[PDB]
Ligand binder design. Structure first.
Ligand SMILES: CCCCCCCCCCCCCCCCCC(=O)OC[C@H](COP(=O)([O-])OCC(O)COP(=O)([O-])OC[C@@H](COC(=O)CCCCCCCCCCCCCCCCC)OC(=O)CCCCCCCCCCCCCCCCC)OC(=O)CCCCCCCCCCCCCCCCC
Ligand SMILES: CCCCCCCCCCCCCCCCCC(=O)OC[C@H](COP(=O)([O-])OCC(O)COP(=O)([O-])OC[C@@H](COC(=O)CCCCCCCCCCCCCCCCC)OC(=O)CCCCCCCCCCCCCCCCC)OC(=O)CCCCCCCCCCCCCCCCC
Ligand code: BCL
Ligand code: BCL
Ligand code: BCL
Ligand code: BCL
Ligand SMILES: CC[C@H]1c2cc3[nH]c4c(c3C)C(=O)[C@H](C(=O)OC)c4c3nc(cc4[nH]c(cc(n2)[C@@H]1C)c(C(C)=O)c4C)[C@@H](C)[C@@H]3CCC(=O)OC/C=C(\C)CCC[C@H](C)CCC[C@H](C)CCCC(C)C
Ligand SMILES: COC1=C(OC)C(=O)C(C/C=C(\C)CC/C=C(\C)CC/C=C(\C)CC/C=C(\C)CC/C=C(\C)CC/C=C(\C)CC/C=C(\C)CCC=C(C)C)=C(C)C1=O
Ligand SMILES: CCCCCC/C=C\CCCCCCCCCC(=O)O[C@H](COC(=O)CCCCCCCCCCCCCCC)COP(=O)(O)OC[C@@H](O)CO
Ligand SMILES: [Ca+2]
Ligand SMILES: [Ca+2]
Lengths: 42, 40, 259, 65, 277, 49, 44, 50, 43, 44, 44, 43, 42, 44, 43, 37, 42, 38
């Protein structure tokens, strides 16, 4: 609206954003479980 | 600020729910931290 | 709560890194503020691309900022669009970065040192709405300081030390009392022209005004006013630019070089 | 040189005399100062300049690498 | 490249040396003859600094850490003669290149302002900083008697040089020209802060207000301190303070050693030995 | 919040992308450097293997 | 209280709040690091 | 993983992101090489081997 | 007419080239790291 | 309109051909130089 | 892969590439000259 | 390879090339003068 | 066509440029042969 | 080879050439003076 | 050759040459004074 | 004009050759003074 | 011609210059003879 | 420049150059007599 974006475009932008965050927060979990296997910190 | 009364309704409605989700995450983290090493 | 975060890091190192981050942000902000006049740039990259690629560099431009002018003079946007113009010159060579040649008669060409934009066609105003720069014939409450020459009746000489007229009136500033212009009654066309103070030297010994910008015969082409009691921002710029052009176009030896 | 008087047809004599006098005075001051610095030609020390001799194993300046 | 209003001002002529040989623009820069000379002086100076870092003071203390790279002047036993390249002649070559580059920059500015039709205040002001550098590396070493009195070229080592030179007089704060220069520097900083603050305050008023006029600028400082200097006079004063600071700093450094070889507090004895007290 | 997507109606979506990319890059660099500063997690001078 | 947004700009408030929370979290983590009883990057 | 991701090039212009990524990758490569050259273990020039 | 001026059939082509031009670079990186592991392993 | 830079397809293929030929010559010279340098004294 | 020249201007790309390559060559030579192992002016 | 001069203009290119060649020659000579094994001014 | 030169002028410039550059490289080759005969650096 | 002296001004070229030669001569003389085996003033 | 004054201003050439010669003489005297074998300001 | 672009070479090249000859004489005398290679 | 000095004014001024310089140089050479008598610098 | 007045300047320029060089050569001969450097 203010930023020149309609509602129907905002909905699918939100969907794609969520689907990208899912993969980004999925790969980090693998990285952190490998790091814990390597050298635990807690 | 050029906002109508009804425009200032759903913004607050979303704002409170987002804040309470953040607070729930904070509470879980703090309970786990106390389970790790208490500070009192 | 101590001064050593780890075996190597300490507080005074984290503080300097935080300062560097803030400084990077501040530099980006300042460079974005710098780009409110004259952007996007005019280059070959834009015109080859058929007006498709716009050259702004990094960072890009900011959202327009509004100035409101007093006495209902209007509103001006700090980043704005302006109409592309056709210059009065012709390139010396076709390679990029080459200079231009001031086509025509250089003094009456509007190019180079004798160039100016087109400002608003209204007079600058005081806090009460009066014109700001006016002759002493209407600012009667003004006066010349004591023990000072009072340059009325002084002869004005040209670049080559030849007389080109005499002073007739002095244009002063109501808001800040100081002299902004001299009025010269040219004894070649029976006309009156304005002369900025920045282009005149006061020879107080023999009572003369020296104009090293243009010669004596050039005082016949100075742009004139619309009305004999006030001046506008457009005409002031035109008058100053005409004299500034003489710093390069007056004589054949002023284009250079020394060797 | 035979017709050197034409050199005054290009340079104004009134400025030339000022410049020449100033330059000559500056040169004289510089040369006098240079002589005053030199250890051989320093008349301010007096005609009867006798530096102090060192009778024993003494040195006016400390040693340096 | 070009600003949207710049094409009107790219005219031919106004050069000092070269004419049409080097009269062109390279991107946004104007080069000219002095542009070529200055650019290549700077390039050779940079390359020699990098080579001096590559050689290092030894084969063991050589390092590419930017804070620790230092190129040092010769020994005091060489006098004013020319030192071997590895023992301090590289410093002399780099000094010559730096002087050439600075002078070329100033002359290019003179050409630019001849082209634009404006005054010559800017190269004139730059000449003061050039003169301060020349006093640092040319006048004082000649008066003292050797090139070894110059400072080393390094980001952290020239600070060591400043500290040791300062402590050669046991208390450098008591140098009078030093006090004058410091007063000018502090006053210049204060005046710059006030000029910027006032211009921004007038140009950016309170919300829902129009741009302020010239009377407000004078009224503000007449109501704070009882006097206002004006729009042109504030720039006059800023230039005056900024140049006086540098002039008195050059005076202060050129009298330390050549004209005074004792502690700086002792210089004040003329005041304490007056017959009035 | 089930109607959170309207946050894209007020903030331009072509700037959050740049901001998050730069923020994530800088955060990753900072965490790698903090780990390198320690003597327990430094993988370049640990002495293994 | 749903009239508070008639005074404060929602966008400005959200941006400032996110920046403030991020800086506060960074500060608290660093303070915990500086305490030898809570430094988790050392031995135990 | 979001088949319509190609719409991302309608938001940010490709040319400036290409310039940015090329500069960033060059800087990162130089930094990593210098960091390795600054350590005793991984300095392949002064190791003495072979 | 989006905020880049790229048509619907142009962003698709740019993406199709971009994915392959990045996959090959990543493959070269993978090969270089496999070779570097056999030289002086770090973990 | 025209291309984003103003070059047609053929005018951007001639440049690509000359560019790749120059790059191939450069890389061949570099490969020979590196082989000779390794023959001089190895670094790994 | 010849349509890249319809996005970037060849002249600016060429000047930037040549500058980067020249600087890189000088940098690598200076890095090699700072180590006694590979200094060919005194070590060879 | 003769259309390069339709991309680069001779007047600026030749100036830059000659300047860089001169600076490179000076750098190589200076590097040699600083190496005792190749200094030709030692007798 | 950014350099204000046609094909014929570009070719005419290139011929003299390449001839001069070849003549410049010959002297360098000779100088390096002599320098190698003076004191080999490998 | 001579097709240069048409828009390449000889008058402007001579000044630059003389300056170049003078600077080169000064540099070579000072470099010779920096070496003890060729300094013709201090020696002998 | 003698037409060199057709392509050079005689006055400016003299003004520049005199300064050049003065500076050159000053430099040579400075160098001679800095060598203890040729310094004449002793004894 | 045509009377400078193609004729003024005849004096420029002669002057350059005359300068190179003097340079060669100076270098031969310098070598007879103290050979360096 | 440039400085507006008639061919008689310049020829008059040159004689005065070339006589005053003669007297100045006589004074200078006398001073140098005395100085060399005092303490020779060669 | 006009042939009537273009080398008339050269005519006295040459003589001034020769006069300047004669005393320079005399000075150099005396300097070599004082303390030879080669
Ligand atoms: C991790 C890394 C951390 C950093 C991460 C981020 C990095 C990236 C950052 C990117 C952005 C960079 C900055 C660019 C933004 C910008 O320029 O804005 C444009 C904006 C343009 O404004 P404008 O267009 O002129 O606005 C005109 C409007 O009409 C009117 O405008 P307005 O009123 O809407 O403006 C809001 C205004 C607020 O306006 C109001 O609230 C109403 C009027 C003022 C009322 C309050 C009075 C002021 C309070 C002080 C009271 C003093 C009491 C007596 C003295 C006590 C002294 C202790 O803002 C302020 O003035 C803040 C108060 C500042 C006063 C004190 C500043 C000096 C004291 C410093 C204390 C010690 C600091 C140590 C650290 O400029 C500002 O907003 C300036 C704000 C004030 C400047 C200083 C702010 C603090 C800076 C600290 C620097 C050092 C930090 C070091 C950190 C790292 C080391 C640890
Ligand atoms: C504690 C502080 C410590 C500070 C440490 C650092 C201090 C030193 C910093 C050194 C910075 C050097 C800047 C070089 C500027 C070059 C010109 C330029 O393009 O500017 C780029 C940039 C603006 O670019 P633009 O106008 O948007 O670009 C136009 C289009 O992109 C046009 O598009 P385009 O296609 O033309 O783009 C190509 C672009 C190329 O851009 C670049 O090369 C990168 C430039 C940035 C790196 O522009 C050029 O073509 C340049 C050509 C240069 C040719 C050079 C060879 C011949 C030159 C001969 C000259 C005569 C001799 O200017 C700056 O970034 C200046 C930043 C200043 C930051 C200063 C921060 C510290 C200040 C002190 C603090 C004081 C208190 C503050 C409160
Ligand atoms: C200390 C123990 C381990 C180690 C533990 C970890 C842990 C735990 C993590 C990493 C992660 C990373 N490590 Mg590691 N890592 C080690 C040593 C290294 C060394 C080295 C020189 O030894 C290098 C070069 C790296 C490099 C990396 C990066 C690949 C990554 C962080 C980049 C980032 O935050 O992007 C963020 C910036 C962006 C802009 C990403 C945005 C994504 C967008 C949507 C996609 C566009 C492309 C984008 C620009 C790049 C995508 C790359 C992917 C995010 C991977 N690590 C040591 C050996 N490392 C992090 C990771 O795996 O992230 C997935 C992570 O969680
Ligand atoms: C223990 C040491 C002593 C002391 C010993 C000295 C010594 C020694 C010196 C000073 C000098 C100064 N001291 Mg102190 N000083 C002390 C304590 C102080 C204190 C304080 C708060 O206590 C202050 C405020 C000062 C202040 C000052 C200034 C008056 C002065 C430095 C400014 C200057 O010279 O500008 C001069 C500016 C320049 C030289 C800039 C030149 C730059 C030019 C233009 C070259 C171009 C730059 C670059 C190449 C461009 C390209 C860069 C990038 C590629 C773009 N001192 C202590 C007590 N001080 C210095 C001085 O007076 O020098 C004249 C000096 O030598
Ligand atoms: C010292 C004992 C524990 C520890 C004790 C705690 C405690 C207690 C807390 C954290 C919290 C956090 N810790 Mg921890 N933490 C430790 C060490 C680490 C290390 C490390 C290098 O070892 C890292 C990288 C982190 C990182 C984090 C973040 C995930 C989080 C801070 C969020 C924030 O700043 O919001 C600021 C960002 C915004 C406000 C963004 C703006 C709005 C956004 C869009 C909405 C979401 C906000 C934020 C992104 C929420 C993230 C939650 C996710 C589920 C991760 N911790 C050690 C091991 N940590 C806090 C947390 O859980 O926050 C949720 C918290 O309360
Ligand atoms: C171990 C140290 C070895 C050594 C081992 C190597 C190895 C291995 C290599 C070099 C390479 C180089 N070395 Mg080495 N080198 C040594 C000592 C030297 C000495 C010396 C004083 O002793 C010199 C002068 C050099 C000089 C050089 C350069 C010729 C070259 C870097 C090219 C460049 O920067 O292009 C940057 C500039 C550009 C890319 C732009 C200019 C090119 C033109 C204008 C663009 C068109 C391209 C054209 C069609 C094809 C290429 C032509 C190029 C001129 C080659 N080396 C010692 C003996 N050297 C590299 C090389 O061979 O490059 C070919 C290389 O791989
Ligand atoms: C005299 C009043 C103040 C002043 C004025 C001033 N400075 C100026 C100007 C003016 C009016 C310009 O017009 C000019 C300019 O272009 O400004 C943008 C400039 C300038 N002042 C600069 C810097 C500068 N000014 C300083 C000071 C001051 N400048 C005074 C306080 C300082 C200080 C205090 O340190 C610095 C660092 C430049 C940004 C610029 C002049 C740029 C220039 O000359 O460029 C040509 C040279 C190069 C590009 C490369 C030189 C090559 C050398 C080999 C470099 C190294 C030389 C050095 C001796 C060795 C290393 C030293 C170590 C300490 C690291
Ligand atoms: C918009 O323009 C401006 C004005 O005009 C309206 C101002 O009046 C002003 C106010 C300025 C003043 C009231 C005068 C400033 C005077 C200052 C800073 C003191 C400096 C003068 C001195 C004599 C101190 C120096 C003395 C020694 C070093 C000894 C500013 C800042 C301004 O920007
Ligand atoms: C890093 C560099 C990245 C690219 C920089 C760039 O692309 O700048 C280029 C400079 O190339 C050029 O000088 C090429 C010629 C280089 C001259 C270098 C001069 C050195 C001495 C001064 C383009 O500039 P210009 O052709 O002048 O302008 C083009 C038009 O806008 C007209 O103004
Ligand atoms: Ca390891
Ligand atoms: Ca190895």
């Amino acid at each position: 609206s203010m930023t020149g974006l309609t509602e129907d475009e905002a909905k699918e932008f939100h969907g794609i954003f969520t689907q990208s965050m899912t993969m980004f927060f999925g790969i980090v979990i693998i990285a952190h479980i490998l790091a814990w296997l390597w050298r635990p910190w807690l | 600020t050029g906002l109508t009364e009804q425009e200032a309704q759903e913004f607050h409605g979303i704002f409170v729910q987002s804040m309470t989700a953040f607070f729930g995450i904070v509470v879980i983290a703090h309970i786990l931290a106390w389970l790790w090493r208490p500070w009192l | 709560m101590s001064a050593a975060i780890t075996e190597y890091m300490d507080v005074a190192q984290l503080t300097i890194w935080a300062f560097w981050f803030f400084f990077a942000g501040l530099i980006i902000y300042l460079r974005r503020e710098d780009k409110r006049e004259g952007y996007p740039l005019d280059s070959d990259r834009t015109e080859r691309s058929g007006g498709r690629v716009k050259v702004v560099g990094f960072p890009d431009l900011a959202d327009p900022k509004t100035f409101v002018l007093p006495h209902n003079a209007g509103t001006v946007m700090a980043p704005r669009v302006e109409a592309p113009t056709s210059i009065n010159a012709t390139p010396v060579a076709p390679f990029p970065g080459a200079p231009f040649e001031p086509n025509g008669d250089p003094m009456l060409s509007g190019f180079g040192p004798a160039a100016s934009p087109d400002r608003a066609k209204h007079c600058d105003l005081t806090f009460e709405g009066l014109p700001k720069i006016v002759p002493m014939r209407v600012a009667t409450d003004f006066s010349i300081a004591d023990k000072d020459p009072d340059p009325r009746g002084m002869t004005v000489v040209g670049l080559d030390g030849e007389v080109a007229g005499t002073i007739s009136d002095i244009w002063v500033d109501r808001s800040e009392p100081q002299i902004r212009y001299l009025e010269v009654d040219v004894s070649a066309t029976k006309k009156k022209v304005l002369l900025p103070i920045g282009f005149s030297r006061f020879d107080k010994k023999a009572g003369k005004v020296k104009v090293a910008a243009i010669k004596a015969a050039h005082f016949a082409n100075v742009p004139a006013l619309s009305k004999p009691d006030q001046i506008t921002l457009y005409e002031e710029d035109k008058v100053c630019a005409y004299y500034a052009g003489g710093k390069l176009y007056a004589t054949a030896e002023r284009a250079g070089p020394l060797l | 040189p035979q017709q050197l008087y034409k050199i005054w047809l290009a340079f104004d004599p009134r400025m030339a005399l000022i410049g020449l006098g100033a330059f000559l005075f500056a040169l004289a001051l510089f040369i006098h100062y240079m002589l005053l610095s030199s250890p051989g030609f320093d008349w301010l020390l007096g005609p009867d300049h006798a530096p102090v001799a060192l009778s024993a194993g003494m040195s006016a300046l400390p040693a340096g690498r | 490249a070009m600003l949207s209003f710049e094409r009107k001002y790219r005219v031919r002529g106004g050069t000092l040396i070269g004419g049409d040989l080097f009269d062109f623009w390279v991107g946004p820069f104007y080069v000219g003859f002095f542009g070529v000379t200055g650019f290549f002086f700077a390039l050779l100076g940079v390359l020699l600094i990098v080579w001096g870092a590559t050689i290092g003071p030894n084969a063991e203390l050589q390092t590419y850490n930017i804070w620790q790279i230092s190129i040092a002047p010769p020994d005091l036993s060489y006098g004013l003669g020319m030192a071997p390249l590895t023992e301090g002649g590289l410093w002399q070559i780099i000094t010559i290149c730096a002087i050439g580059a600075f002078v070329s920059w100033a002359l290019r500015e003179v050409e630019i302002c001849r082209k634009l039709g404006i005054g010559f205040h800017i190269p004139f002001a730059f000449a003061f900083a050039i003169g301060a550098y020349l006093v640092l590396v040319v006048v004082r070493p000649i008066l003292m008697g050797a090139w070894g009195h110059g400072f080393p070229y390094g980001i952290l080592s020239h600070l060591d040089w400043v500290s040791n030179v300062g402590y050669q007089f046991l208390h450098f704060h008591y140098n009078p020209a030093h006090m004058l220069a410091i007063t000018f520097f502090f006053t210049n900083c204060l005046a710059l802060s006030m000029h910027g603050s006032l211009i921004l305050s007038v140009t950016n008023p309170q919300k829902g207000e129009e741009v302020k006029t010239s009377e407000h600028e004078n009224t503000f400082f007449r109501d704070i301190v009882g006097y206002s200097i004006g729009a042109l006079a504030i720039h006059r004063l800023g230039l005056f303070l900024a140049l006086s600071a540098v002039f008195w700093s050059a005076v202060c450094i050129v009298i330390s050693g050549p004209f005074w070889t004792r502690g700086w507090p002792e210089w004040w004895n003329w005041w304490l030995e007056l017959p009035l007290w | 919040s089930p109607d959170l997507w309207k946050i894209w109606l007020l903030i331009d979506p072509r700037r959050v992308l740049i901001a998050v990319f730069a923020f994530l890059t800088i955060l990753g660099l900072a965490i790698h450097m903090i780990l390198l500063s320690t003597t327990e997690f430094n993988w370049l001078e640990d002495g293994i293997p | 209280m749903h009239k508070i947004w008639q005074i404060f700009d929602p966008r400005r408030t959200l941006v400032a709040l996110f920046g403030f929370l991020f800086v506060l979290g960074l500060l608290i983590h660093f303070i915990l690091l500086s305490s030898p009883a809570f430094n988790w990057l050392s031995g135990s």
